Amino acid sequence: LEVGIQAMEHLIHVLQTDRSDSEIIGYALDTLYNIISNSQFTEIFIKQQENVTLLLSLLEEFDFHVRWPGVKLLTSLLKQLGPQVQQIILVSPMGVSRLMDLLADSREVIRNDGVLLLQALTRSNGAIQKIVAFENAFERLLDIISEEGNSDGGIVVEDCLILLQNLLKNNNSNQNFFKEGSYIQRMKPWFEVGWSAQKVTNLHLMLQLVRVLVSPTNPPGATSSCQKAMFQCGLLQQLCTILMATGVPADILTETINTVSEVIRGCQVNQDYFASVNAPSPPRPAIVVLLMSMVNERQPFVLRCAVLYCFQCFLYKNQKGQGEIVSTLLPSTIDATGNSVSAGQLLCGGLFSTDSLSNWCAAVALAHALQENATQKEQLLRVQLATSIGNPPVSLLQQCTNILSQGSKIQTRVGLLMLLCTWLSNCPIAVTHFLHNSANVPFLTGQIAENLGEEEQLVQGLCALLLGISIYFNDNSLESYMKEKLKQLIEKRIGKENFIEKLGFISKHELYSRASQKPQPNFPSPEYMIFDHEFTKLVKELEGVITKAIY
């Protein structure tokens, strides 16, 4: 029957008139919850709005047998028609304050279902999120988490973490209020290293909450000040202890690295601290343990991505650390014990490995050590590589260009071309060192000019970008390949219009867009590790001007 509505408008009638009899109120709310919970009936219950304001009134009743079904009914209304029921409540005076009192209930069957009610209340509603926080939610919910033994708690801490993230996710006002209120420091005891499926669950939501506060997506000063607070109160420090601790699930580990990544990104004090962390062995620097895993083929792909990202994060806006990395490739000392390995050595081993995952990673990692740093771009020009037991040395730059014409897989050459483009970009001297080897320009011209399917379109485009950078950042000091001669080479060998189209293959690649959204390595599987976030910005920055400059 459609008329399950008839015997409901009549339970509402009990709730209006019979309120001195709590046993009948309890029964009617319980029966109404039954009908609405399993919607059609929910839309009808709310259409008479003063029904919702009656429920609100009924929830001030301390009687267990009234307040409990009340809670569960209002949650059910909220889950089903969230925006509308949230509106009726916001527009009703003391509406949200009152619902907060349920979190103060001392019967814990009611405060627990209370938390689940507030989740449904705050979901996707900014203003309500703000009022909940004005009503002391942050302290109350942090208190209940402490009391329940933190990450060792049950579905109860899971539920307070979900609610805390409703309040903080996409809500700058409330992130600021959380910081301003000194609540960050209460996030630290969360992080003392057993391990049930629930503990894993709780701790994963805790790390996402740390990540929310320091997300690259935030106003920049909001992330800065949380990053500083997280240092000041020992929370970064505590996260790092999880990194080198024994017997922590692999997924907790991956996500603790991603978190630290964002807690240090672009913060000198935090990056200085991160690099200063050693593991137990001979002892290993944190940079070195990152780079070792990144280049290790037996480590899971998800983990390699997380250590790449920690490493970029370390280097981000960090010219001190960029130099520290690059100087490693210009060795100054002998270590008498054959023991220690350095950043430079691990990266050089990665560049020329047979694993293309390693090639790509090492090459992006290197580009990150060069970005917006002309000093280091120039230093990297001095790197010499050993060849055979009789032959002369080859430079790093030239060896990287050399792999492009080997039968190498595209993933290794996109990696290498992103390095080469970044390396020559805004560095007239590296352009000269590149254009000084006569094998190079004829190579790029040749790769760009020959019609080669659709798979090799990406590599062709990157070569165009490189050749184009050779022209744009050319200071005309090499008489063998000057600006105007290079343009006439394109015209004669390739055709300028044809050249600018191959250059366009980059921006148009199906994966380019996504790469360009956020800094974190997003790849679903190893085959998708193609573009690096920061490279997408250099394309966007240069594509236009390089086209303009070709005429």
Author numbering: 55 to 92, 111 to 265, 271 to 358, 360 to 629
The article reads:
The architecture of p115 comprises a long central coiled-coil region, a large globular N-terminal domain and a C-terminal acidic region. p115 binds to a specific set of soluble N-ethylmaleimide-sensitive-factor attachment protein receptors (SNAREs), aiding formation of a cis-SNARE complex that promotes the antero-grade ER-to-Golgi transport by targeting COP II vesicles to the Golgi apparatus. In addition to its major role in exocytotic transport, p115 functions in retrograde Golgi-to-ER trans-port, intra-Golgi transport and Golgi biogenesis of the Golgi apparatus, due to essential interactions with the coat-protein complex I (COP I) subunit β-COP and the conserved-oligomeric-Golgi complex (COG) subunit COG2.
We used a construct comprising the globular head region of p115 (p115GHR, residues Asp54 to Tyr629) for crystallization. The fragment lacks 53 N-terminal residues that are predicted to be disordered and the C-terminal coiled-coil domain (p115CC). p115GHR consists of a multi-helical β-catenin-like armadillo fold arranged in a regular right-handed superhelix. ARM1 and ARM2 are connected by a highly acidic and flexible loop (residues 92–110), which is not visible in the electron density. This structural motif of elongated loops culminates in the formation of a short helix inserted in the H2-H3 loop (37 residues) of the terminal USO repeat which we named the USO helix. It folds back into the superhelical groove, leading to a globular C-terminus of p115GHR and covering helices H3 of ARM8-ARM9, while the USO helix points into the center of the groove. In the crystal structure, a dimeric arrangement between p115GHR molecules results from their packing along a dyad axis.
